[model samples]
Target: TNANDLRNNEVFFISPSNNTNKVLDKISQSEVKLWNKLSGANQKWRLIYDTNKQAYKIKVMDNTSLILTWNAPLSSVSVKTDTNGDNQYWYLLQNYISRNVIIRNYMNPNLVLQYNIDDTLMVSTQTSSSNQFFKFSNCIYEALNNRNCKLQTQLNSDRFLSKNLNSQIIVLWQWFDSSRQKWIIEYNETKSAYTLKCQENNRYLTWIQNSNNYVETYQSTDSLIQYWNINYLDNDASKYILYNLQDTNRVLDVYNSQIANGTHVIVDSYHGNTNQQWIINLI
Candidate 1:
């Protein structure tokens, strides 16, 4: 896959060719292994390309501060806090036919990250073998700034949750790095509740009380209407449902599962549909 196809600040799962069903997994702070996909946070990683180093820094989604690294030559690769060292940099060599890539260490281009018969992670001399090939799973969201992010729909990859002009109504639009698509996510002390504030209008996402019953952006009033409960659909934290506090049964949704630009975003009774599910990404 081309480097441009990879989204920055997004989380993904890396599957080694030795076992396509298994993914590179962070078992602990200092341990890495290959295990069957579980869609867990530990298995989710963010590959950030470093233009200066001409390599990628792989960080775990569960803890962005930690990165994949090895202690010494031929040592087992593990997760460690960023030390701003070359050991943390990885180079991706693409295999166009297999649609996979080989991960090599920038500090030791001769060595590539691989998994053994026992599913243990290690670095060895580069080999033209499937064991060295790795596949990537697209992430649901890409982080923008500190505690700020954007939500994109899985149905339409290019469309994003965005504000509708100067109106309170929100809709789906192609990304343009506009302030309307940026949301400041504030989490409550319990961490179960959240409030999304639009950077463009400086308003919070809420529901209108009148017969409209539609979701809209409004000035922050510290009311329940401005609050949302995040419910993860899986352990990977890739997919989620956003429920408005105004009505527990209602959720933020794309009108009628529309897949067009400017589609009206409304509040509807939760039916466990993809329209109500969002992929939260960091900007």
Candidate 2:
């Protein structure tokens, strides 16, 4: 079990200087307190003045445990999120009763509770309310919550690569012949098969050819003909089946009535027949 003291198990380093007035004045300034002590190695012990006792207290920690305590009447205390500034430029954080500690950083605005003494009041935010305010013998109010600042990364929409590419290929051209009700796909020898680009910027297509064949098409922003999911049964057949991931049940097949290269494909449900299935090969 932790100590029952209100300020138990808390780790904070207080500045040690022979001049108490100088130390207090420095803390009130914008400069950070820790960095100043690091720069001056000779400064070993800092003095904290208690207004209620009207006496100066000398603070020391055991060598083995190294538990440092600051038991002076809290004159004035402010919290800061940033640690980069010099001894005089730290930004003060504000605490509200209902909300988290307010930091100037736009991204991380809240200060969460680091330590909770009583489990009943666990994870409480700092507030101007009487119960949450800092306490001392002389009774000076101070902020207790520490601020944490972090920045988020930016993602570019255009640069994102697709995780799954459509294996089925389709052909869309300007010409249209409705009598055949099927579109002729042009073979690209360099590409090893037919090539198609995605049609819509964000939308994809599902196709059903014949009675049971299912083919899917995905529109790439770069290509006008777009790309579609192509699959082959035997691995050597010139013609392959196409299906879209958007609608796995549908197949993309040649429209029975269209004879041109630019025939439109429609969606249809799959049945246990050969008409809905297609075979695609590299040759």
Candidate 3:
């Protein structure tokens, strides 16, 4: 009773092999990526134990309705919508030493949870490697599960950091309850940073370093240039400072503090200016 134990129905952030804040994060619909924990909606998972099946349905704690799914071509691991099939079920193998648990695919007992040589989480042949183990860290807050957000500018709360349809260009546009303006923020605990996923096209917010300070949303890549440090402006929870985790000096800026639509969003030197402040509104 003195120590915390993982329980069903409680939300958790999962980490692989001794990573303190590094967790199982999802950005794409195709695969689960390993990133630093940000306590994001995407990072939270819920274990729904199936008493009849004698297994666990590892569900994503977001409105998207995905679960940890394993299949050969397994490509390793991906979060999938429940097929109501046996392949989506899992069981935990407890470790004696640290109580760190390993999750095994119930469909294929030989497969265990392990990130590949890179960020994607996939079940690999079990060995004694650290990556094979996962830790369930409980979340302090219950998930909202609404799963989408808007990044409004500090210069003017009316303008948002938005991606245009059929374009990778991220710019300022008024809130319209639209898809392009909606974003999903995921955390990378290993880097203590965040990734911005645009709801419009499922692309990622990327900073092409030295490319004339270009900032745009691109397809997913495990790169430092894709991670950001989204911090509050010291006092307001709604207002935030968006900067590159790779280079904190590169803050997301509104060109010349313009308040009009299509004002380009770029990365530039940080000076605690109003242009760099963003309003992270959950919708």
Candidate 4:
């Protein structure tokens, strides 16, 4: 006539293999109370009994939420069938030498219900065999996706922004060289300058630098600044300019320099003047 027993009667018996068989004969009443306290109180009541394995079998009203059922008698745990219920999903957290069960959702394994690490509900998969598997060590997170991971500096600048260079992260630097052939410039982050290189045989779309830090113009041939130009307009303000397919001058005209800091070198009509030269320091 008990309400708990009535609810338990409606639940169907799940697979007994995953159930833990541990009879309550040796367990003290005080110990049972403590276990119940740690098991959480919001879960629905189920009729649990020890099978031949002496493990506890839980009959759930809804199998969807059943992740893994335990045989309390034998202290064994088993994975739940793919049922959409609170019991069907759970988070396995490292608790000292043993793992602890926490509330979790199936839709997105990243989120949780209540009680989590750092107050954030995001919980990673513990049983996954993919690169998603993670372990906490020295308060640092490491991914097993790739071995020999390295940090690389950006070819465009001196600052290191990304890691592990490959076709996905780096592009070839292409330009029209003096030999009337399309070549690629090797950008060295150490020197912060474009190094000479040819890559037409590779047939790759190489990256180009914006000449003035404004519009797109690259040094393809041997010019003043290695096929680059400089422009000086007002005092204490100069710009490095370049020639492109869009410029109206076409000839060596005063192209605009967009760099606020760094070496500012400009081109004049004929005579090489020092006033048109400036230096740049990136902030």
Candidate 5:
């Protein structure tokens, strides 16, 4: 299933559940170990599907020639040349015991990637330990497709885009950690567009034909009204803007700059103002 698959050739950080700041890192020619977040070449890693092995190869970002290897003969964990060996095959799983995403060894089903007592990465049979739980972070922008995230208005950082309670309209609401506030920006490869979906209702953010004024959520559909295009503004690389497929002139904006709870999300003209800029963060 594509559920466990990370976007092909995207770099990300692997960190243990106990402390996300202490990520899986290897300095120079040392054993793969856990270290504080450096966001450097050594800390960056990516997943590439290896169809022949029926698993994925975890590649060290700085050098694609190297991959995370189990080093079976030495019973160790480290980076080795990309041989696509059985020891290099790995499956990303959401195991029942861990409940969190984990790196499971394909050659040894019992072994899972974990940061042990010495802060060194090692494979072990203990699936219940928190150290065994790992997550990917700091992925590139395109990787947001099909993933859960929260969008905050650039003008009002504390205000998040959410579905109005029991209503069809979208609104600006405080982060209440409710499923209504969580969204998935599903990218449609066919249309080269995106559709925003709310978690709780599974409804899509649509540009209804009602006087062409507001945005709301409705049952998922393939209509062009459900399609959107997100592009970063010219001056600000981090700020994103969303507009419906029908009219690029009218964009998703905070109605009249109302930066409070229940502020309506309207389809208005883009002014390159903070009112329409969005900062989407992955959950």
Candidate 6:
């Protein structure tokens, strides 16, 4: 894959070829190592392309101010503030195999970043082995706030959560980049919850305690019904359960398991079904 395939500012996990499950992780203030993908901030990184240098600078999501850097030969790679040094620049070399890349240091092209058997990160001479190759996996770190995103139903891949026109109800519709399908999620710092605002009408997704307990898009208001607690499912940050703050037992759900477009979206008591699970994809 080309370097452009990896979207800039998007967080991802760098998994070495030797072990697909383990990813490169930031240890301490300066130490870099490898660990299993637990969906933590220390394992998430964003690649920022440097136009002038014609390379990329990998920045840690936990601390956006720091980036991966190295100084001596065979030394561990560490995170440091941006210095615009050659050691901070890196090349994402596309491997001959599909969907894999070789990360090379700009200061020393021969020295490639790799993880040892003990899950320690260091630079070594380039080789054709799997240890030198890495695979990129998108990450959903908590640091991604106010990001433009779309919510899709795990039950139906072709359908998305969309706002209805001239109506307060929300429904499932075919995927489109239209504003109706776009949502802006803002974190409530004081309550430690999130408020979802519709990009199409600028309304907030509010939960109502009617007979049906349905959800709808309503005018912005300072109420608990508009706040949601996003709970990750199965330790996978990408999948989440949108629990309404008004009622902790209720969640955003698709009505009656309808597969057709324009199906009703409502709030129902949590049943731990696939219909209640949602996948949030960044736009």
The full ranking of all candidates by TM-score, starting with the best, is: 6, 1, 5, 3, 2, 4
Candidate 1 local lDDT, residue 98: 67
Q: Residues 1-283, candidate 1, lDDT per residue (tens digit)?
A: 1321344544677887656578888887778898888877888887788998889988886644579996665567888888877988999777667677888999888788887888887899877787788888653322222377888876688888889896888889989999999988876533235778899988988877766666678886767778786555433355777888768688888887897988977778888768888888777
Summarize candidate 5's per-residue lDDT along 1-283 as a digit string, tens digits. Answer: 2222355444567888878787778676645788988766677776787776667787766643478989785557998886668888888776545446778888887787778778887777765668778867633333578889898998777899999998989999999898999998887766667788999899988887766478898887867778887765543335678878877777888888888899988888778788989998887
* Residue 248 lDDT, candidate 1, scale 0-100: 69
- Candidate achieving the largest lDDT: 6
lDDT of 6 at 93: 69
Candidate 4 Cα misplacement greater than 4 A, ranges: 1-67, 71-75, 91-140, 143-147, 150-283
Question: Considering lDDT, where higher is better, how would the candidates rank from best to worst?
Answer: 6, 5, 1, 3, 2, 4
lDDT, candidates in the order shown:
0.76, 0.26, 0.74, 0.24, 0.76, 0.78
Q: Model 2, 1-283: lDDT tens per residue? A: 0111112112123321221211111222221232223212111222233344322222221111111121112222232222322211211232333222221111121321112222111113345433332211100001111111110001111111111233443332331222111222332333222333222223333233455443345442333222333433211121234444445455443345343433333444444233334332111
- Number of clashing residue pairs, candidate 1: 8
Winner of 2 and 6 under lDDT: 6
Q: Candidate 6, overall lDDT?
A: 0.78
After superposing candidate 5, which stretches have Cα over 4 Å from the reference?
A: 1-141
**Model 4 quality (TM-score):** 0.16
Give the per-residue lDDT of model 3 (tens digit) for 1-283.
1112455544567787667668888777756888877766777776788888777887775567788888666446777778877788888766656868888888887888786656667777789888787777655222322257877887886898889666788889988888888888776555545688888788988887765676788888777889886654433333567778668778989888898999888899887678888767678
Each model's TM-score?
0.53, 0.20, 0.49, 0.16, 0.51, 0.53
Using TM-score as the measure, which candidate wins? Answer: 6
Give candidate 6's TM-score. 0.53
Residue-level lDDT of model 4, residues 1-283, one tens digit each, is 0111112112211111112121111022111110111112112223333233222223222222333333222333333443334333334233343222222333344443331222211234334321222221110001111112111111222211111123212221222121212223333223222322223223211123344322112334432233221122111122222222222122122223222222222223332223323222221
Distance from true position, residue 69, model 1, in Å?
0.3
